[PDB]
């Protein structure tokens, strides 16, 4: 459940980040004050074992706007980038 719901959470997060710009605040609330849910939801934020497009898009722009806030410990970022590297008949 903390996996499947976190998908829907980051989904709406990036959606409003497109409708708005620059990091909607509701996730920023749970970030500092709810660290268990923060890390439980931050997993699907980085679980993208898929090739990157030549140009930036919503996902990666979201992640960039996150990382400039000095959050996102670089361990999970390293894991992120290496994962995206990839007779009877």
């Amino acid at each position: 459940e903390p996996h499947s719901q976190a998908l829907q959470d980051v989904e709406k997060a990036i959606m409003v980040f497109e409708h708005t710009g620059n990091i909607p605040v509701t996730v920023m609330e749970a970030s500092i004050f709810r660290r268990p849910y923060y890390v439980s939801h931050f997993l699907p934020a980085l679980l993208t074992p898929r090739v990157l497009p030549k140009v930036p898009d919503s996902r990666v722009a979201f992640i960039e706007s996150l990382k400039r806030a000095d959050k996102i410990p670089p361990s999970l970022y390293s894991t992120y980038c290496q994962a995206c590297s990839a007779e009877p008949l």
Binding site: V10, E11, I14, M15, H19, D57, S58, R59
Partner: protein, 50 residues
């Protein structure tokens, strides 16, 4: 993945443009129904705190 959000239509809102523009010149002390259906959508929304 999510990889963004499809826009789909900028045209139907341009249709609503002429719909409500016609209704404006039509009506002329009452209140507009758009805010009413707004408040209906808002009360219908989950009052939770997630």
């Amino acid at each position: 993945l999510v990889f963004g959000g499809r826009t789909g239509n900028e045209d139907i809102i341009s249709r609503l443009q002429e719909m409500v523009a016609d209704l404006e010149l039509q009506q002329d002390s009452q209140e507009h129904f758009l805010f009413e259906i707004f408040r209906r959508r808002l009360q219908a929304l989950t009052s939770g705190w997630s």
